[PDB]
Chain length 254, copies 3
């Protein structure tokens, strides 16, 4: 437990779809596959403390599929809780683009378990960047029966909106006067962010007069909310600015 501290337990957190090659029956399915899964020991009808295949050969597998790429640090294997069935060695295969698949260690066997309940962790030689990952049992005791977990680095999710060409107008109010002067253009995002975004807001067109050879121009967001922000174009000192244009990039996390 300490050895995978701070990592995401994929199956525990229901972060992946699980597809199996075959299921012994309807109470031996991938619904029973989570590490340390335990069921009703007094009632036989809820089935096995494991996913168990129907066909017993070297062509079986369980696939965990994530739509968002992850960095897989480790796979834990465990035997069947309620009978002497466990997987003693297996192959790992994975895919990042879900078109081409690859074999970990070129398909060499990874060491599995030797009993019902003692978990055996395997940390991948190099962390594997993938969307989908599969356990392919190669050798077994009794039957192809397992519980398992995959451990990944935490993911971060961003949502970004770009908006183009926020403009002061021609011969705008920055083109007269002196001292600090601002022209404000309210901007509404196309959709409302779920959390407060950070906003980059940068020049794409500049039409301005120097003042004793000095250029002084700026643009900055103000009053950023989930819905929009005020685009503040500005100059200062004696500078006269005919126009300014900017594009923005707004990004919220998680």
């Amino acid at each position: 437990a300490m050895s995978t501290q701070g990592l995401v337990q994929l199956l525990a957190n229901a972060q992946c779809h699980l597809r199996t090659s075959t299921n012994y029956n309807g109470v031996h399915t991938q619904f029973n596959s989570a590490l340390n899964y335990k069921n009703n020991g007094t009632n036989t009808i809820d089935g096995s403390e494991a996913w168990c295949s129907s066909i017993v050969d070297t062509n079986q597998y369980i696939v965990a599929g994530c739509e968002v790429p992850r960095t897989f640090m480790c796979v834990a294997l465990q035997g069947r809780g309620d009978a002497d069935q466990w997987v003693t060695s297996y192959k790992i295969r994975y895919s990042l683009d879900n078109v081409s698949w690859f074999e970990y260690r070129n398909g060499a066997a990874v060491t599995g378990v030797t009993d019902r309940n003692t978990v055996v962790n395997h940390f991948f030689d190099t962390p594997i960047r993938a969307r989908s990952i599969a356990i392919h049992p190669l050798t077994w005791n009794g039957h192809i029966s397992l519980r398992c977990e995959f451990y990944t680095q935490p993911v971060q999710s961003s949502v970004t909106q770009v908006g183009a060409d926020i403009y002061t107008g021609d011969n705008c109010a920055l083109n007269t006067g002196s001292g600090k002067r601002e022209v404000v253009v309210p901007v509404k995002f196309q959709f409302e962010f779920a959390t407060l975004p950070k906003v980059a807001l940068n020049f794409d067109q500049i039409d301005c007069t120097d003042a004793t050879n000095q250029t002084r121009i700026g643009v900055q967001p103000r009053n950023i909310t989930t819905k929009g922000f005020d685009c503040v174009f500005y100059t200062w000192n004696e500078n006269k600015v005919y126009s300014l244009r900017a594009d923005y990039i707004a990004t919220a996390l998680e």
Copy 2:
């Protein structure tokens, strides 16, 4: 009351993991709100997810890889027998490492019959990836149908491209009037939908014209594959070079 919200289970937007299943026809396959099955055949099981162990340690977990704002959870009893959950607690996780309890684990009111849906709108919407219903009290058995209602999500894909350049002493450095130098840009991969493009200066080398600076950069002919980076000046200005970075984002 849930108009405009995404019905997660109905839309197959989440994986469902349960603590235990009574048997193979009482599983989370049967868990969607208003799920109804063959009333003339017993073999397809319950109009509910039903646990195998009946205690206060059961749960159904719904997992989303894309974070959601959970507005409401709806509970419903079992359609075909007098089994329902009378109260429950809610637990959730945003990062799938640390979990939290809604209301510090206090009970939320469930249902009182087979079919009448009881909506619970969270005191404050919950930002999370995974969410779990933990039954605390029940009538007859731990048996339920449910739904989670979230705000619609948006998905963006962004490509950054660096250092699109006019070249030194470019064509904008001679002549009068509106003048343009066009640099075609191809995105590293083709977007699925039409992107919007921010394209902004990172290097400027230009001459003033009667003290005026006039410079611009703008995309033209944006497609899913790329765009034309148009560097320009106008009037009498002479521009030796311009450089820009772009940010292209496509939605949905």
Copy 3:
């Protein structure tokens, strides 16, 4: 080869599968993947298909993806172990998971005529959606199928914006001549999973021309997953009092 280069969604476990009904617990969506085959010597593992419990025109299997996909093709296949198959169906889909639509306004699409011969349907126009559903309309024997959806590959990006990286007032660019720089180290709020690309552009400029010439620049150097150095610079005889920039850093896959 017609689907060369496309993602096989179910085979890659890229979707959740919900069904209207399942005949029993060994005829579920666990058995729905194109070319799914099971133990032909043991009855207990059920059908080489998803099979409904109710036989009417109201059944369906829904495939849901959280990340939007461009659906190119749906492949239908009958039941491997009995003479049951879906001869026509409609396709429904949703992009936002609030409003649903029907392909061809709900007209039938041609299904299969036997147990095993796959019939591909390439959509008239590719469908942009999160969730998609096969709704059997006519069948032989029973509503029993295997299927696949084929999507364009997806790309996933993560972006961080940081604002207002600044030289300071009256910075080192404001004296001297030749190539001169001011370096401001930047640390990303979180570490990216893969190496980002960085856009870094001006939002505030305070500078003196040199014989009517403006010369200013800003560029990232030493980009890592953790951050970068923001290099503000000028050259020739220009004196630059200050420069400010915002950054956008994006990592792929």
